[PDB]
């Protein structure tokens, strides 16, 4: 039986695609099959910003950000709880989850 | 739908179909007479000419070929004959 209509790959209209290296176990997987996450964060955590802020010599200062793109094989994706198993009917839903914008 | 008169389509509905998919095929091209400002002659030019057309007198260009219908020189006028 086919578990997924797209074979869980997202590759139709071509024959080959170069692989990539997993960011955790350094495995080789096709680029279209890997799970990709883009992350934007600050250099320092929010509790430490005040100590840096008042120790500067430039009056008001803005700590820079850091930009990373991590990408995993499926075996490392669901062991680190990046994604998890869904139900049979809930599998066919590709909308990104609604991030909480009120936080109680 | 389920009851249609296929013999008498509206003229508006036939202006949108492909040139070959109508009830009877018919071209949508035409010939035209171009008035060169420099001279007083008249030349018959196809609407979809693939070659640069030169007028008989004073030897001036009148149109430039392209992918579809040739574009005329800016300082020129034409009538559909």
């Amino acid at each position: 039986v086919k578990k997924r209509k797209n074979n869980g790959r997202n590759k139709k209209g071509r024959g080959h695609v170069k692989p990539i290296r997993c960011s955790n176990c350094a495995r080789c997987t096709p680029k279209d099959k890997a799970i990709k996450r883009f992350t934007i964060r600050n250099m320092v955590e929010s509790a430490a910003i005040r100590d840096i802020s008042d120790a500067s010599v430039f009056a008001e200062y803005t700590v820079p950000k850091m930009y990373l793109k991590l990408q995993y094989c499926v075996s490392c994706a669901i062991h680190g709880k990046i994604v998890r198993v869904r139900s049979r009917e809930g599998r066919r839903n590709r909308a990104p989850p609604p991030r909480v914008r009120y936080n109680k | 739908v389920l009851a249609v008169d296929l013999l008498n389509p509206s003229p508006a509905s036939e202006a949108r179909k492909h040139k070959l998919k109508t009830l009877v095929p018919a071209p949508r091209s035409f010939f035209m007479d171009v008035k060169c400002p420099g001279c007083f002659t008249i030349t018959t030019v196809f609407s979809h000419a693939q070659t640069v057309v030169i007028c008989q007198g004073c030897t001036n260009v009148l149109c430039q070929p392209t992918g579809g219908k040739a574009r005329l020189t800016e300082g020129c006028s034409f009538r559909r004959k």
Binding site: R21, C22, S23, C25, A26, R27, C28, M43, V44, E45, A48, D51, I52, A55, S56, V57, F58, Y61, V63, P64, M66, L68, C73 | -
Partner: protein, 135 residues
């Protein structure tokens, strides 16, 4: 002993923090990179060698840098954090942020934070094989 200067002015240094996932390095040089002023690693402070990367060890190693560099006359630092780089994780280790605070709290001045991790445009083959570490 130290640079002669008026009381208003302050002299600058640069700190190069190398924080991997196995150890952390605190290194202070002059304005250029040629001359090293002080350098202490996280392994000098801890005695169990599984805590060389612990955030606690970075704080202790960072504190005596400020003490040791205080009498040299340098009063301000530039900061350049870097990860392993190359084929590595490119994510700074746990001790990267612990050391930075200890310089600020100790009384030293801070300016111009930056990240200088080296990234390849197209790298050679990476260690592990095609199947990865299967544990």
């Amino acid at each position: 002993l130290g640079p002669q200067v008026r009381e208003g002015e302050l002299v600058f240094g640069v700190a190069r923090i190398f924080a991997s996932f196995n150890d952390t390095f605190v290194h202070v040089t002059d304005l250029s990179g040629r001359e090293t002023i002080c350098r202490v690693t996280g392994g000098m402070k801890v005695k169990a060698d599984r805590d060389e990367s612990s955030p606690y060890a970075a704080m202790l190693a960072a504190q005596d840098v400020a003490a040791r560099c205080k009498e040299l006359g340098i009063t301000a630092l530039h900061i350049k954090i870097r990860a392993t780089g190359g084929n590595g994780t490119k994510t700074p280790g746990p001790g990267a942020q612990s050391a930075l605070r200890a310089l600020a709290r100790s009384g030293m001045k801070i300016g111009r934070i930056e990240d200088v991790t080296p990234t390849p445009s197209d790298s050679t083959r990476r260690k592990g094989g095609r199947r990865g570490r299967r544990l």
